[PDB]
Design a protein around this ligand. Structure first.
Ligand SMILES: Nc1ncnc2c1ncn2[C@H]1C[C@H](O)[C@@H](COP(=O)(O)NP(=O)(O)OP(=O)(O)O)O1
Ligand SMILES: Nc1ncnc2c1ncn2[C@H]1C[C@H](O)[C@@H](COP(=O)(O)NP(=O)(O)OP(=O)(O)O)O1
Ligand SMILES: [Cl-]
Ligand SMILES: [Cl-]
Ligand SMILES: [Cl-]
Ligand SMILES: [Cl-]
Ligand SMILES: [Cl-]
Ligand SMILES: [Cl-]
Ligand SMILES: [Cl-]
Ligand SMILES: [Cl-]
Ligand SMILES: [Cl-]
Ligand SMILES: [K+]
Ligand SMILES: [K+]
Ligand SMILES: [K+]
Ligand SMILES: [K+]
Ligand SMILES: [Mg+2]
Ligand SMILES: [Mg+2]
Ligand SMILES: [Mg+2]
Ligand SMILES: [Mg+2]
Lengths: 446, 442
DNA sequence: ATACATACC
DNA sequence: TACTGGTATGTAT
DNA sequence: ATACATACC
DNA sequence: TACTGGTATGTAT
């Protein structure tokens, strides 16, 4: 089914008829170049699954036994270090962009809406999700699913502004909170909770926009956070409260929209939560990882744990280590400060460009935008990468690393232009037929 | 209603079109503000007509002599020695999109969004669809209309390809926008008289050879543009820029027109020319002059004395140049810019903290634009449009120049603060904000 | 170091 | 008519 | 120097 | 559902 076939792994999308919805998507997508490319990618994934299953058939009882012991040794060390003492909160705005648009055009409140264009949606409101409409779906497809759908263009500066208002509230509870995008954040409220236990009602009191008082527990802190967000912005958030970031993230989606959920911070509660948790609900387990694990009979975190020996023989160390943490209900119990960025990039999609001189011009423009962006943070990098996507949706990237760092439109373009030239020359006399180009700079000195 | 002063919009059922536009527009906030602006123009027309009725024979006679004196100097210096070309791409953005998606060449299309179109192709223009009209209205006029989102970087790239051709014929050509330019081909015509066929042969992408006349040069330019970019241009040839621009529109699209450089050809062209065809005569000026019985450049000349009493010096000087078929005969290099701005429309913002943040973001973009050209300025102006489409601008000027996001924002935020305080306790209900910097050291 | 894929919002 | 854009990282070479 | 209006693409 | 954005300059205070 790939990308196109409805992805219901999002809040507010339970109980839909994927057979009926996918017939509509397929009718709207039939014969397109996008579809052609999706079939190619699906066949790739299936080959990868086949290679894993062939490797699996070679595994013997002896090997599995040995892996089992080595994995259980590592699990014992993870288990002994389990930290249940931090209160991690994940805050996540409800239908963020759509909610802002509905707030400011209340005629939209009772309608199914989405934000974006006929080419692409960035989100949808909860009414629209009941028709299968969602982020990453083209608007023209969404309209087939929901003829009455209102598609609203984005107002990115508004969303940055709302986000600033939210973050100012969040800073009160964890001044080192980790903002992930505009609409979500992790907080460690451990310290705050400790101080809060001796705060008089005056420091936990808010007037409505007659006053209200919030208690001293974690659930009360998060009710206070949500209340302040709603009062300041007129928008709701959901929240998860858990002993680590992995669990808190799963929890914040659970009672969406306008809800919250806490896993009590005792081991038994964690394990009972994780027990029948579908792995697709955990951050980092995407469509492909899900498909590969499903081939092994793995759908839930219990199954993930049960097959840990096998996973240690079929997946890299970074992957089976990650799976084992999930399967034990472990994750980060402290938040790290936003580090040095490793890359910066710009890319753009367009109607077909096939003339070499126009491709060079496009490349130069992208190099200039990217130089402007680097200038803002005074960064310089040693590696320039171009990205080309042809009209059949096939992506290539072509990188070059240089001895001395670069920053200016001129320097970036002198590298990118050569990378592009090499591609134009390779297909000659056939023009490159492009729908997207991008330029990325990386290898900043650390 | 339908502003039909464009190529391809001749002989439309404007009755039907204006009904559809009007059903789509009446009752809106937009329409409310249009009525207010139309009333202000009508008031301005009424003030003028009441002034006109007080003008004496003696006043008219004194004006007439001053204007005739000024017209003598203008006529004396009439310069017919330069061949000025105006090049203008046909349906520019739409043509680019049709070029690169074959399914579109036989359909009505427009470029932009459901909120706003930047242009339309000639098929769509037959339904009254055009630039400056919202796509949602265009779709009522033309259900089958294809609205293509813009690809601005492609248009810039095509413009570069076009400008490279134009530099062969006049290296000091003046680019006016992405799709249009003025060239002075006088020098090139001198050189070209003695050029062998080798220097005037271009192959189709079979050879083609072009002659030595101005018309043949412009054919050669238009042929080259179509071979390089796959798009057509129209062109106007004339002794000055004012006339050249009129001519480029005359046989649009994919056409060409010349006014030969003799006084008589200029006057026969100008004679029954509707004034609205001249660049700088917009809707408002046209309506005011129509109120005086002025539709053509002939009528504009005749009422020159009256024009000098009813209009500022700048305006009647300008009208007089037009009525004599005069204009620029040498093209200046693009001088120092006078300002830089950014503005943006959004769904309603009414919370003061959000308004400050938008102002901040706008100030950063603007500092970024300035940093690119290393410019600093002393005047910062904010622009606020409310949900009833009313525009306010508020400026402040400082001693020493500024350029950083912080400096620009320090000034802008106090201007915004003043507007928020003046309406308190009612919030400002905005649909647009902008920031502009000006007063560069020149 | 480079190419391509996966994942997230 | 029309299938996004920015950053990090995993996998494989 | 400031505010608002017109014009162009 | 939905009426643009950038620059210059004219009109009036
Ligand atoms: N594929 C995508 N492409 C572009 N923008 C996207 C996107 N996915 C999301 N965004 C933008 C638009 C989103 O509004 C915003 C936050 O992402 P979420 O928190 O994942 N989604 P939301 O808040 O809408 O709904 P809820 O949390 O209740 O499920 O990021
Ligand atoms: N009101 C507007 N708003 C935004 N962009 C606009 C615009 N009007 C035009 N443009 C953009 C899009 C336009 O394509 C481009 C050139 O403007 P023209 O030469 O005045 N119009 P075209 O070339 O389309 O048609 P033809 O010359 O055959 O009459 O500028
Ligand atoms: Cl889809
Ligand atoms: Cl098919
Ligand atoms: Cl739409
Ligand atoms: Cl915005
Ligand atoms: Cl390619
Ligand atoms: Cl209109
Ligand atoms: Cl559309
Ligand atoms: Cl360019
Ligand atoms: Cl230009
Ligand atoms: K191709
Ligand atoms: K208002
Ligand atoms: K206002
Ligand atoms: K498509
Ligand atoms: Mg969200
Ligand atoms: Mg989120
Ligand atoms: Mg044009
Ligand atoms: Mg033009």
């Amino acid at each position: 089914l790939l990308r196109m076939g409805l992805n219901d792994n999002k809040a507010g999308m339970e109980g839909l008829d994927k057979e009926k919805i996918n017939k509509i998507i397929m009718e709207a997508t039939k014969g397109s170049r996008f579809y052609g490319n999706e079939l190619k990618k699906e066949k790739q994934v299936n080959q990868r699954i086949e290679n894993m299953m062939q490797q699996k058939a070679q595994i013997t009882s002896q090997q599995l036994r040995k892996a089992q012991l080595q994995v259980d040794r590592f699990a014992m060390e993870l288990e002994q270090s389990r930290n249940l003492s931090n209160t991690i909160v994940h805050i996540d705005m409800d239908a963020f962009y759509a909610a802002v648009e509905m707030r400011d055009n209340p005629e939209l409140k009772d309608k199914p809406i989405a934000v974006g264009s006929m080419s692409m949606l960035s989100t949808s409101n909860y009414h629209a999700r009941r028709f299968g409409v969602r982020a990453a779906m083209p608007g023209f497809i969404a309209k087939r699913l929901c003829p009455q759908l209102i598609i609203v263009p984005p107002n990115f500066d508004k969303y940055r502004a709302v986000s600033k208002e939210v973050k100012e509230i969040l800073a009160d509870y964890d001044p080192n909170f980790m903002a992930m995008s505009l609409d979500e954040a992790y907080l460690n409220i451990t310290k705050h909770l400790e101080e809060r236990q001796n705060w008089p009602e005056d420091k936990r009191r808010y007037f409505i926009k007659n006053s209200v008082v919030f208690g001293t527990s974690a659930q009360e802190v998060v009710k206070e956070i949500r209340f302040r967000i709603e009062q300041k912005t007129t928008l709701t958030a959901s929240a998860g409260i858990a002993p680590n970031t992995m669990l808190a993230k799963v929890c914040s989606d659970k009672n969406k929209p306008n809800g919250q959920y806490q896993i009590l911070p005792n081991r038994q509660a964690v394990m009972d939560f994780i027990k029948d948790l579908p792995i697709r609900k955990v951050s980092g387990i995407g469509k492909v990882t899900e498909k590969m694990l499903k081939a092994l009979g793995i759908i839930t975190c219990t199954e993930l744990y049960q097959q840990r020996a096998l996973l240690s023989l079929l997946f890299s160390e970074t992957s089976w280590h990650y799976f084992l943490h999930i399967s034990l209900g472990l994750g980060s119990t402290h938040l790290t400060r936003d580090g040095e960025r490793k890359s910066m990039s710009v890319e753009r999609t367009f109607s077909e460009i096939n003339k070499a001189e126009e491709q060079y011009s496009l490349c130069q423009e992208l190099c200039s935008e990217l130089a402007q962006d680097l200038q803002k943070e005074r960064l310089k990098g040693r590696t320039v990468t171009i990205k080309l996507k042809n009209v059949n949706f096939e992506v290539k990237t072509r990188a070059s690393t240089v001895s001395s760092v670069v920053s200016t439109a001129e320097e970036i373009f002198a590298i990118a232009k050569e990378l592009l030239k090499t591609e134009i020359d390779a297909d000659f006399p056939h023009p490159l037929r492009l729908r997207l180009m991008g330029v990325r700079i990386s290898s900043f000195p650390n």
